[PDB]
Amino acid sequence: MKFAEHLSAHITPEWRKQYIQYEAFKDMLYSAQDQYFAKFEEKFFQTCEKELAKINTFYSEKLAEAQRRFATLQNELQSSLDAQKHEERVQHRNIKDLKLAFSEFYLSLILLQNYQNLNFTGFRKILKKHDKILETSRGADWRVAHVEVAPFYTCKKINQLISETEAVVTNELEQPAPAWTTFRVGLFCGIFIVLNITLVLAAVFKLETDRSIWPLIRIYRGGFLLIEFLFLLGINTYGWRQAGVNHVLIFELNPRSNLSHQHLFEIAGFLGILWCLSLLACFFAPISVIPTYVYPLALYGFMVFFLINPTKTFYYKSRFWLLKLLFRVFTAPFHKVGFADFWLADQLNSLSVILMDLEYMICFYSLELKWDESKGLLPNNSGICHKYTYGVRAIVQCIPAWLRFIQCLRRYRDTKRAFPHLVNAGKYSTTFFMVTFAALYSTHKERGHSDTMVFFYLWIVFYIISSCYTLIWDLKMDWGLFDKNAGENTFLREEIVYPQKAYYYCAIIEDVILRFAWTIQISITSTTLLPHSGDIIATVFAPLEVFRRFVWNFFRLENEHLNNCGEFRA
Amino acid sequence: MKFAEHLSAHITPEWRKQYIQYEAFKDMLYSAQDQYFAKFEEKFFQTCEKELAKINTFYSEKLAEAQRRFATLQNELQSSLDAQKHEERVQHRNIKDLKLAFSEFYLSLILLQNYQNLNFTGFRKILKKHDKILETSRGADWRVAHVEVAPFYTCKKINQLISETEAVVTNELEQPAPAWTTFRVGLFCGIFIVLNITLVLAAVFKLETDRSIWPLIRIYRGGFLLIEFLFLLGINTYGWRQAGVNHVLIFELNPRSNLSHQHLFEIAGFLGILWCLSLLACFFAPISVIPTYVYPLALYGFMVFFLINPTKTFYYKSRFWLLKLLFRVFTAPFHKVGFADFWLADQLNSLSVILMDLEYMICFYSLELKWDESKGLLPNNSGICHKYTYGVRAIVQCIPAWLRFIQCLRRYRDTKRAFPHLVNAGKYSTTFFMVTFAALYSTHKERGHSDTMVFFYLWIVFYIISSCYTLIWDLKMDWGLFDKNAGENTFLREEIVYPQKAYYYCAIIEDVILRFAWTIQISITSTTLLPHSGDIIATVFAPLEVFRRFVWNFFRLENEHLNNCGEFRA
Numbered sequence A, B: 001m002k003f004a005e006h007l008s009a010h011i012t013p014e015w016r017k018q019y020i021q022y023e024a025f026k027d028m029l030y031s032a033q034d035q036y037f038a039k040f041e042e043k044f045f046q047t048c049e050k051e052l053a054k055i056n057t058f059y060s061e062k063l064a065e066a067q068r069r070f071a072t073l074q075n076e077l078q079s080s081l082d083a084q085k086h087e088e089r090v091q092h093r094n095i096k097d098l099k100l101a102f103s104e105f106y107l108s109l110i111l112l113q114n115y116q117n118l119n120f121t122g123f124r125k126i127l128k129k130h131d132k133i134l135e136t137s138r139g140a141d142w143r144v145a146h147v148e149v150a151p152f153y154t155c156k157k158i159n160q161l162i163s164e165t166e167a168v169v170t171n172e173l174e175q176p177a178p179a180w181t182t183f184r185v186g187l188f189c190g191i192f193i194v195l196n197i198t199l200v201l202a203a204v205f206k207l208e209t210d211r212s213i214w215p216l217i218r219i220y221r222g223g224f225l226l227i228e229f230l231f232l233l234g235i236n237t238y239g240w241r242q243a244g245v246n247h248v249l250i251f252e253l254n255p256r257s258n259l260s261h262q263h264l265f266e267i268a269g270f271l272g273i274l275w276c277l278s279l280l281a282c283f284f285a286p287i288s289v290i291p292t293y294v295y296p297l298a299l300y301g302f303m304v305f306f307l308i309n310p311t312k313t314f315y316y317k318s319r320f321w322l323l324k325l326l327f328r329v330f331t332a333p334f335h336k337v338g339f340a341d342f343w344l345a346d347q348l349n350s351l352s353v354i355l356m357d358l359e360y361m362i363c364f365y366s367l368e369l370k371w372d373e374s375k376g377l378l379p380n381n382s383g384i385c386h387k388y389t390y391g392v393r394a395i396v397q398c399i400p401a402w403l404r405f406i407q408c409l410r411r412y413r414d415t416k417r418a419f420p421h422l423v424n425a426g427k428y429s430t431t432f433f434m435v436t437f438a439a440l441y442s443t444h445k446e447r448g449h450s451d452t453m454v455f456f457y458l459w460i461v462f463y464i465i466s467s468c469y470t471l472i473w474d475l476k477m478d479w480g481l482f483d484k485n486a487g488e489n490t491f492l493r494e495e496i497v498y499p500q501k502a503y504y505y506c507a508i509i510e511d512v513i514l515r516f517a518w519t520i521q522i523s524i525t526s527t528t529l530l531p532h533s534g535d536i537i538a539t540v541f542a543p544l545e546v547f548r549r550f551v552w553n554f555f556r557l558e559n560e561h562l563n564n565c566g567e568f569r570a
């Protein structure tokens, strides 16, 4: 695909003869590969010099007439304001015609850096293409000897031009997804809606409830949290794009190819059917010979095979990007950290239930599950797997904290700043004390120690420090709120990107309620309180917790683009 | 909505200042209404003269350079052909660039012809709007004395210019619906699919089959037939639009607003969801107190209220367009006939099973249904309603033939041509003899007359008469096939529109096959053969006749657009 034929796709035909004719210069690139060698390798560098001057002459002429039009647009605007200083109703209609003229020139300006960047990207593609076609390194230097020094690239006046246009718009003045991809979202949004209703009815009416269903819920709870996250992240990618925050830049995402919000809802929908089908099948058990415990591996196994597929199909381009990011996060100290590394490494800190539930499924299927009985997923009637023996659950529980804490220490040894790179380590180091004091208390109660209640105090004394540490932190720097430049935006930062100010006030209240209760759940599961209360409270809070991470994703990215608090891009 | 802002909506901004500025004159009109009288009328007969000359000067100049560009393209294309007469690879690449050049030139011709016709429409809207705002007839007189004689309207050279453009393209050279509608279509499709599978499973397993279920099928068949027809008609409109057939013209539809295929798919999906819900509810009967027979009334009454709703919401425009067409069709002799009337009155001829089932439902609910028992839709265990007593079934069966015969007679009386306006009369009149002889056979067999088998031979003899009459007719004039000007397209007409001829051959075979069984289906319903065989053969043949009607609709429109066989537009 080579960026070759898709280059001219996002180019207006009015400049068709003017842009780099990438499709043309490939054709005789393969001519010599099918058909002197030094002459054939130099002619392209002279051919690219033909395109060098063609874009050099046009851009400078366009740039010169753009800044001259910047005088003209200036001459246009305040004169309308001077005209402002039915007659005025036509005048602002004439202004709105001028706002169109400013917008078309802004659109005309928009085309100009594309005439630079698309060409600027268009060059390098044909120079490395020449670089393995003829096995040369001069092309890698030709972009340095010509492109990196060419007038159409070195002069960045076009970048600062729209910077004035955007400013003057805010001072004086003030592609859709393919139809098939939109349809498939509806089809997968409909099969998921009805299938849930039959699941509700099947549990209440058909399936019997005398047998304990606790193992079934604690096994299938892992799947639901992932499906909630992917769908909730689909709303996020729509919010960023609509608001205006350039998530394509902060994420260091591929500038050309990216997943729109419609694409995310399709992956969320498809897994929704498979999860619902597996749960519904386990109830009725239509096969009557295939055991019920084989269905959970079919569901989780399918997702794993979906993610790690070599086949260059089914979102293959975007699947490796996650795989590269996931591995770089897990081996945190061995690599540097960017915004992509930080984001995923933190997202796993609110998805800790899935990692825990993986341990339960592994233990249950290997210690307490009988592979000689058809219905084994539902017990006939006290299992180590759902307990905290040896604190194996505590070790996996602290895994998400380990990834971030190591990253912050690694992020300290490249810049040597105690603030805000070591204070961040404090907020992640508190969760280690959260689980340790919990596990020791529960074991002491089981043994019967007199000072068991002493360990209860620390687990409650250390309960609060964890909550306020991450609450005062998320509300001050991650979101950037509570600033001295509040002005009109009282208790807020000076500039807001999202339309309505009530949303910022709404999330401040919500980020406190769901934070003081979440730290109970991450520590309740270690201790033993009640078999019903050991699930009924962990199943009503875990789907709530991922919602908190969803709203926190709305403001961290905005505060990373407005102020660059993270200093990732400098 | 007055065509006012949507005029400028489908106008390229490059000519925005050149088109009529409908919004400004609307505003001055409401300024008048909010605030001399003749002096008002007089000064806006010159105001439209301002746009009269503005568009007169632009169009004639644009057409003057267009025909000069027509000389230019005639200086361009054969020069490429002369250049045609890797070198030739670059030559034909420049040839394709010149085809692109002719493409935006044709786009500019498109811009010119709408700069004529949309401007023409805007004139008539503003003049008529002035005709009730100030209660004057001069505006219509002005649209006759200036618009109807204007240089930009009287000179139709642009139409033949685009004709020449299409001719040269065929000689030498050779908007998407909003995403919400597509998503809704997908949602309804998925819900329908899952509910159908649930219905099949419930029928096979849960509901008991010892009791007779024939009344349920003979009641619920009509909704399925209607839904199938609507979905197939959506596919029909998609095929028409994609092929190039200008169905906007033959149907005399509104040039601006029309129902694209996805709207039809949405309506079909919604009705399918409702029908499936009604059937599934009738199966389980969850309420256990509400009787099972009220669900068909709920479904059919909801459909009726949907079609007759006064509210100007939910496809209101198309809704009353269909209502007007149906009213004009049913009172056939009192009105003239256009393509819409003929098309709907013929569509109703292949949907007779819906009327038959409506009659059956009326009789069953008025004569044999006990309104004092909850479960009555399923008989406990010989019903006059499902029989053919008095030939009420016969008369409702021949109703559509009566409508079409009356329409053809009215067309003949308004034209006085024995061909082709009287052979159609016999083709539609054979059905009366069909049903009369079938009913007489059945009655005589019930009585036990010796010459009942005489009526058997008479029915069988008239069977082939009815079958070949409409089969030869549909294959010769309605489709236009089997023409002497075959040439390469053997057994076909000289010009074909759809891409592949195998479609034509398959449709010929399909029509010949299915025309000999729909007649059996429409003739058995009067006679009595077997309670199982009565229902089964009709139930497996009814959903096929609508498919045959769809495939006939696929070709009748092409034939009338290509040859004007019906002579409706002359």
Ligand SMILES: CCCCCCCCCCCCCCCCCC(=O)OC[C@H](COP(=O)(O)OCCN)OC(=O)CCCCCCCCCCCCCCCCC
Pocket (backbone or CB within 6 Å): A175, A176, A177, A182, A185, A189, A192, A193, A196, A197, A200, A235, A238, A260, A261, A262, A265, B179, B180, B183
């Ligand atoms: C007891 C049984 C219960 C069973 C429950 C099972 C769960 C049901 C969940 C239903 C999921 C529905 C979500 C699908 C929405 C798809 C919308 C869509 O595709 O529209 C995209 C929309 C328009 O895009 P446009 O601007 O035209 O073009 C964009 C350029 N690419 O642009 C947008 O992206 C904006 C509008 C869409 C995003 C905002 C709203 C989406 C979600 C709203 C709430 C859905 C309900 C959530 C679950 C219930 C909890 C409240």
Ligand SMILES: CCCCCCCCCCCCCCCCCC(=O)OC[C@H](COP(=O)(O)OCCN)OC(=O)CCCCCCCCCCCCCCCCC
Pocket (backbone or CB within 6 Å): A222, A223, A226, A233, A237, A253, A254, A257, A258, A259, A267, A300, A303, A304, A306, A307, A315, A317, A318, A319, A321, A322, A351, A354
């Ligand atoms: C092992 C523990 C697992 C626990 C959960 C951790 C994983 C959670 C899910 C993955 C992370 C969330 C998605 C992050 C992406 C959000 C960023 C965004 O908006 O961009 C979309 C991203 C960019 O892709 P794009 O720009 O097209 O490609 C760049 C290179 N050309 O493109 C993307 O959408 C990237 C994400 C991959 C594509 C969608 C996800 C596919 C995976 C399905 C489920 C995997 C199940 C894992 C096993 C679970 C076992 C219980």
Ligand SMILES: CCCCCCCCCCCCCCCCCC(=O)OC[C@H](COP(=O)(O)OCCN)OC(=O)CCCCCCCCCCCCCCCCC
Pocket (backbone or CB within 6 Å): A191, A198, A277, A278, A280, A281, A284, A286, A295, A298, B193, B194, B197, B198, B201, B202, B205, B206
């Ligand atoms: C990857 C996992 C492996 C594959 C999983 C396969 C799909 C999930 C399981 C589907 C099972 C559907 C029900 C099977 C019925 C088997 C019999 C049964 O238990 O029936 C329950 C109920 C009462 O039946 P009863 O009279 O007791 O039967 C006596 C037997 N002679 O009789 C009924 O069935 C009552 C009606 C309720 C049925 C609801 C079924 C809805 C969902 C089924 C699949 C739909 C798929 C939709 C998506 C596909 C793509 C569009």
Ligand SMILES: CCCCCCCCCCCCCCCCCC(=O)OC[C@H](COP(=O)(O)OCCN)OC(=O)CCCCCCCCCCCCCCCCC
Pocket (backbone or CB within 6 Å): A179, A180, A183, B175, B176, B177, B182, B185, B189, B192, B193, B196, B197, B200, B235, B238, B260, B261, B262, B265
């Ligand atoms: C016991 C179990 C029973 C299970 C079965 C129950 C019934 C299931 C019926 C499912 C019906 C689904 C049909 C919905 C199709 C909608 C597609 C759509 O909207 O796509 C639009 C498509 C592309 O549009 P584009 O050209 O991009 O833009 C047009 C500009 N306005 O434009 C188009 O319209 C062109 C492409 C789509 C139209 C042609 C193909 C549609 C139908 C294909 C066959 C469907 C199956 C029929 C039922 C089975 C019998 C074979």
Ligand SMILES: CCCCCCCCCCCCCCCCCC(=O)OC[C@H](COP(=O)(O)OCCN)OC(=O)CCCCCCCCCCCCCCCCC
Pocket (backbone or CB within 6 Å): B222, B223, B226, B233, B237, B253, B254, B257, B258, B259, B267, B300, B303, B304, B306, B307, B315, B317, B318, B319, B321, B322, B351, B354, B358
């Ligand atoms: C009483 C006996 C009934 C037996 C069956 C007879 C009715 C069959 C269904 C209606 C007729 C078929 C539809 C014809 C449309 C095909 C023409 C076409 O492609 O154009 C769509 C047409 C034009 O609309 P448009 O151009 O937008 O508006 C013009 C004015 N601006 O716009 C249309 O789509 C017009 C049709 C209306 C909109 C869809 C239909 C709504 C009705 C729903 C179901 C009706 C149930 C009737 C009762 C049944 C009782 C058993």
Ligand SMILES: CCCCCCCCCCCCCCCCCC(=O)OC[C@H](COP(=O)(O)OCCN)OC(=O)CCCCCCCCCCCCCCCCC
Pocket (backbone or CB within 6 Å): A193, A194, A197, A198, A201, A202, A205, A206, B191, B198, B277, B278, B280, B281, B284, B285, B286, B295, B298, B299
């Ligand atoms: C226009 C009419 C107005 C609308 C009418 C109502 C909606 C349509 C009918 C829906 C009926 C759903 C099921 C009703 C169950 C009623 C009870 C019953 O008989 O259940 C059957 C079976 C046996 O039940 P049993 O255990 O004997 O009950 C003992 C009571 N304690 O037990 C079972 O239920 C077995 C489990 C299978 C149930 C399958 C249901 C699938 C479809 C349900 C509706 C789907 C939603 C549609 C779309 C929603 C919106 C998008």
Ligand SMILES: O=P(O)(O)O[C@H]1[C@H](OP(=O)(O)O)[C@@H](OP(=O)(O)O)[C@@H](OP(=O)(O)O)[C@H](OP(=O)(O)O)[C@H]1OP(=O)(O)O
Pocket (backbone or CB within 6 Å): A001, A002, A003, A004, A129
């Ligand atoms: O779509 P992708 O998988 O990303 O591959 C394309 C393209 O692949 P094709 O050779 O099959 O067309 C190649 O473009 P060229 O460099 O050969 O011109 C090259 O990838 P491969 O050589 O490995 O096939 C290139 O780089 P990359 O895959 O790293 O992205 C990339 O084009 P883009 O860089 O524009 O995406």
Ligand SMILES: O=P(O)(O)O[C@H]1[C@H](OP(=O)(O)O)[C@@H](OP(=O)(O)O)[C@@H](OP(=O)(O)O)[C@H](OP(=O)(O)O)[C@H]1OP(=O)(O)O
Pocket (backbone or CB within 6 Å): B001, B002, B003, B004, B125, B129
């Ligand atoms: O949306 P529609 O139903 O098509 O009605 C609009 C518009 O209605 P409104 O007055 O409510 O905006 C009127 O436009 P004017 O002719 O008054 O400028 C007029 O309909 P009514 O006067 O009956 O309301 C006109 O005619 P029609 O409804 O017959 O189509 C039609 O605008 P268009 O003719 O451009 O479609």
Ligand SMILES: CC(C)CCC[C@@H](C)[C@H]1CC[C@H]2[C@@H]3CC=C4C[C@@H](O)CC[C@]4(C)[C@H]3CC[C@]12C
Pocket (backbone or CB within 6 Å): A355, A358, A359, A360, A362, A363, A392, A396
């Ligand atoms: C989340 C990532 C790290 C993977 C999941 C955690 C893995 C490493 C955990 C989860 C369940 C764990 C097992 C659970 C129970 C037992 C029984 C006992 O003999 C100790 C080891 C053994 C066999 C554990 C080995 C490690 C294990 C497989």
Ligand SMILES: CC(C)CCC[C@@H](C)[C@H]1CC[C@H]2[C@@H]3CC=C4C[C@@H](O)CC[C@]4(C)[C@H]3CC[C@]12C
Pocket (backbone or CB within 6 Å): A297, A300, A301, A304, A358, A361, A362, A365, A366
């Ligand atoms: C996280 C994803 C990969 C899901 C994990 C599924 C796989 C890795 C797990 C789930 C259940 C596991 C099995 C559970 C029990 C036993 C019996 C033991 O005597 C040998 C290992 C064996 C056979 C395990 C092998 C690994 C296994 C199949």
Ligand SMILES: CC(C)CCC[C@@H](C)[C@H]1CC[C@H]2[C@@H]3CC=C4C[C@@H](O)CC[C@]4(C)[C@H]3CC[C@]12C
Pocket (backbone or CB within 6 Å): A390, A391, A392, A394, A395, A398, A432, A435, A436, A439, A440, A443
């Ligand atoms: C940098 C430092 C502070 C990080 C420490 C993280 C690791 C080493 C800590 C965090 C949680 C801890 C566990 C928490 C609870 C228990 C249960 C107890 O019966 C034995 C020790 C054991 C199993 C702990 C072992 C050490 C542990 C895994």
Ligand SMILES: CC(C)CCC[C@@H](C)[C@H]1CC[C@H]2[C@@H]3CC=C4C[C@@H](O)CC[C@]4(C)[C@H]3CC[C@]12C
Pocket (backbone or CB within 6 Å): A239, A242, A243, A498, A499, A503, A506, A507, A509, A510, A551, A554
């Ligand atoms: C339940 C209460 C206490 C807290 C819940 C807060 C929820 C409802 C609020 C907090 C932040 C909000 C978002 C803030 C900004 C945007 C962008 C806007 O263009 C569409 C709405 C959207 C996407 C909002 C959706 C609703 C939202 C998620």
Ligand SMILES: CC(C)CCC[C@@H](C)[C@H]1CC[C@H]2[C@@H]3CC=C4C[C@@H](O)CC[C@]4(C)[C@H]3CC[C@]12C
Pocket (backbone or CB within 6 Å): B355, B358, B359, B360, B362, B363, B392, B396
């Ligand atoms: C298709 C259009 C014309 C409407 C449907 C046909 C109507 C007119 C038909 C269908 C069912 C018919 C009824 C069926 C049975 C009987 C019983 C007997 O006492 C004769 C009249 C009566 C009561 C009929 C009256 C006319 C009727 C209501």
Ligand SMILES: CC(C)CCC[C@@H](C)[C@H]1CC[C@H]2[C@@H]3CC=C4C[C@@H](O)CC[C@]4(C)[C@H]3CC[C@]12C
Pocket (backbone or CB within 6 Å): B297, B300, B301, B304, B358, B362, B365, B366, B367
């Ligand atoms: C064509 C569409 C509207 C479907 C027809 C539904 C309506 C018109 C029909 C269906 C069943 C019918 C009812 C069937 C039986 C009776 C009992 C009789 O003593 C009085 C009339 C009455 C009460 C009928 C009135 C009309 C009725 C409600």
Ligand SMILES: CC(C)CCC[C@@H](C)[C@H]1CC[C@H]2[C@@H]3CC=C4C[C@@H](O)CC[C@]4(C)[C@H]3CC[C@]12C
Pocket (backbone or CB within 6 Å): B390, B391, B392, B394, B395, B398, B429, B432, B435, B436, B439, B440, B443
């Ligand atoms: C112009 C002419 C040819 C059209 C004739 C159409 C009408 C009048 C015809 C067509 C179908 C006919 C009916 C068909 C069957 C029977 C059953 C029989 O036991 C009595 C007569 C009766 C009820 C017929 C009466 C007349 C009828 C209604």
Ligand SMILES: CC(C)CCC[C@@H](C)[C@H]1CC[C@H]2[C@@H]3CC=C4C[C@@H](O)CC[C@]4(C)[C@H]3CC[C@]12C
Pocket (backbone or CB within 6 Å): B239, B242, B243, B498, B499, B503, B504, B506, B507, B509, B510, B551, B554
């Ligand atoms: C069953 C056999 C004997 C006959 C069935 C005929 C069917 C399959 C054929 C007959 C005519 C065909 C159509 C002819 C033309 C068009 C338009 C084209 O752009 C897409 C295919 C489409 C929409 C075809 C769909 C399939 C079709 C309806």
